[PDB]
Amino acid sequence: ENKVLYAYVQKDDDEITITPGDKISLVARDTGSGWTKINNDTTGETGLVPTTYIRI
Ligand SMILES: [Mg+2]
Incomplete structure (x- = not known):
């Protein structure tokens, strides 16, 4: 699964x-x-995050 x-x-x-x-x-x-x-479905927001901080 995707991860932060x-x-x-x-x-x-x-x-x-x-x-x-x-x-x-x-x-x-x-x-x-x-x-x-990305979308953050936990928080409900959509926007940019640093690529190295997540696995998608
Ligand atoms: Mg701006």
């Missing part, structure tokens, strides 16, 4: 918070920015 490995707190409007154990789903893979767009 490392916690990240939102820092700009396009980002979202993730914490280990949250249920996530992919929106769009990183194209070279270092960020992946």
